[PDB]
Design an enzyme around this catalytic site. Sequence first.
Site, mmCIF file in Angstrom:
data_model
loop_
_atom_site.group_PDB
_atom_site.id
_atom_site.type_symbol
_atom_site.label_atom_id
_atom_site.label_comp_id
_atom_site.label_asym_id
_atom_site.label_seq_id
_atom_site.Cartn_x
_atom_site.Cartn_y
_atom_site.Cartn_z
ATOM 1 C CG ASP A 57 -1.404 1.116 1.870
ATOM 2 O OD1 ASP A 57 -2.447 1.494 1.456
ATOM 3 O OD2 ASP A 57 -0.880 1.726 2.748
ATOM 4 C CD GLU A 104 -1.829 3.251 -3.203
ATOM 5 O OE1 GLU A 104 -1.901 2.842 -2.031
ATOM 6 O OE2 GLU A 104 -1.354 4.286 -3.610
HETATM 7 MG MG LIG Z 1 -3.704 5.515 0.396
#
Ligand SMILES: [Mg+2]
Length: 755
Positions: A430, A483
């Site tokens: 993340d 991400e």
């Molecule tokens: Mg975020």
Amino acid sequence: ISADQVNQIIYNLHHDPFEILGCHLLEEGKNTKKWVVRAYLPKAEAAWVIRPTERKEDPMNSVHHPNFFECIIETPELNHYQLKVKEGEHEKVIYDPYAFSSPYLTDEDIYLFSEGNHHRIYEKLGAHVGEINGVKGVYFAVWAPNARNVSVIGDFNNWDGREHQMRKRNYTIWELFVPEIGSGTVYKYEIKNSEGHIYEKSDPYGFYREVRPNTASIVVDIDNIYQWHDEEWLEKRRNSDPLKQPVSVYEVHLGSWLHGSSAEKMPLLNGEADPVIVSEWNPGARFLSYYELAEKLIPYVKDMGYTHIELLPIAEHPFDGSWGYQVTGFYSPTSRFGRPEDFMYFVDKCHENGIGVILDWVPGHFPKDSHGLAYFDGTHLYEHADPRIGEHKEWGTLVFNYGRHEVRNFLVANVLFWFDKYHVDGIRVDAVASMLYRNYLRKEGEWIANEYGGDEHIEAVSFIREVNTLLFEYFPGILSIAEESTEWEKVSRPVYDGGLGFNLKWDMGWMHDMLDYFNIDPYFRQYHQNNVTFSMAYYYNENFMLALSHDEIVHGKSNMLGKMPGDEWQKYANVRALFTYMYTHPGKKTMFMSMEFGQWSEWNVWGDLEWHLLQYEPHQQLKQFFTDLNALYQQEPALYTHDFEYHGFEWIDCNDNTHSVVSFLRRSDDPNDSLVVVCNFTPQPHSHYRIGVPEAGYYVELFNSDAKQYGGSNMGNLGGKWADEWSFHNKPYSLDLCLPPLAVLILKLDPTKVP
Ligand SMILES: [Mg+2]
Ligand SMILES: [Mg+2]
Ligand SMILES: [Mg+2]
Ligand SMILES: [Mg+2]
């Protein structure tokens, strides 16, 4: 080696097989060394030695007996290898069982860790069951180079460490062997720093931990607690390219999927434990164990047809409300849900059911809690000392010093650890931007540029590249998903091409385009046709994963149905159209628990999902819709073989903004697997709408999101449609379709239909 020595091994007469099995130096050359690796592999017909970090592989030869193998290799250092072992028609890849002849740190272990390159450091740091001086016990070792003293405190000495003071090796690592204790021992390290202050730490390399909010580490005999059965899964993985397969991920937060009753014990794999209450405000509820989750989540997911489960972070973390993103026990699966062998059982059962397991992994920071890594030895050890690069002030957390060798080694070896010990099939990282930028969430005059004047965090980029290089060398076939939210280039491209080395990246622009689009009243979607089509302009720059994640159904954003305009029928219809589009659009797929049954409320990490909704037809129908869509996805090659090639996609027409209609082809290796996809993103049905198609023949209506069994109005083409020789959209043939409202059709040519 002699036949006498081989026979001693084969017949179990040898006094210490470590003398001859494993890796042994034969001789030293001027610029290289010659090594032999030997293995006894009963029932294997062939074996190889893999040197994954050199990209080499050398056959082993049978020597004196068909199951006794040797391999002579010349290289300057032979630190990292695996054995590939063939038994009949099947191959497995393992670490050498004879790799490490002692439980203690060797000179060689210390040197490699000092350089940052000990990929198996967690075999020696932490707590390990073993034998020293003839007596069985536990070996403890911890990196704390500036400590004045360290002692082991635990249950076995009533938390008094005066007779268990550790010994410092090479000015850097403390060790101690404690006889006659074993697995289940509860302990911490008691450290004195250079100022003389005394404090307690959990084991950074600990394998198991008390249940939060307690923080003692617990000794685990990690190689003797579980028997795996997933060799055939692991073999297919290693020999497959996941980029060319269907990848449909069900994203799950284990603590909040389903709760049980706190009035009974938590059942474990062959045992039980006290219940873990979810919170003081909901005291009748407990978490489910890894064992119960294997029994309940896995058949649920299998029946829904997903290919993968992705877990929010399961590494040990002190606060439920972080969702797992603030980790303090990097080497242990959280004890909320039971023991290490229970999570091994969960993974093994996924594999038995043909389901992969992706872990959210959190290398980007760590919180300040006093039991954890912070200020570990009385200095800024794991975190950088400069708060401009060592703290994420807006988050209140600390940033690893990615340039420091032993810190890099902690994290690199940690990623490998989960693939090694727990057989996982991928990781997802993340907020990769948090690592990549030295000015991340920092104001002017509160960060400093890299040595070249730029904002790139050079040490973090280097670390990311090393993690992804290693992961794919040791475990080909895995998923490494990022991400990254700043348009950093070549995220999902090989490191040798200047990439970061991930193999998939979440398409956040796609996610925003879609959710923004569907939130628009349908009459107004004509001013935002670009939301539908724009993401294809940059699509081939990365390998994209189309993710609609947990982060999108919290904080006032509503769950999926709530985002949609209209009456209840149309809200459902919008959900079906969006997800049919998602599953037909090029890229792999991820969606979060609750989305598949139409939960109305936002995800709440403190409760469980609103399962009672599945008593009612409309939620049942939406779940059947997803079940069928996942089945279709796995059944149709054009939805997954050519995601990332031009050939796999072409728009038919995307200009009709006034009616919010778009259409496209998907293709695979066989031209007869081509699919025609047509989308209608208003509630206006169309009785005759012409779409160009590339061939004559009957086009079966293979899927129709307005079908009655999915909750739709049941409008459509009654099985399919003959194409007309009537040029349209620059194609020689064309279909005159009925387009159902707020719905997506998938059609496919049946070239054997009778005219
Ligand atoms: Mg975020
Ligand atoms: Mg004391
Ligand atoms: Mg716009
Ligand atoms: Mg509930």
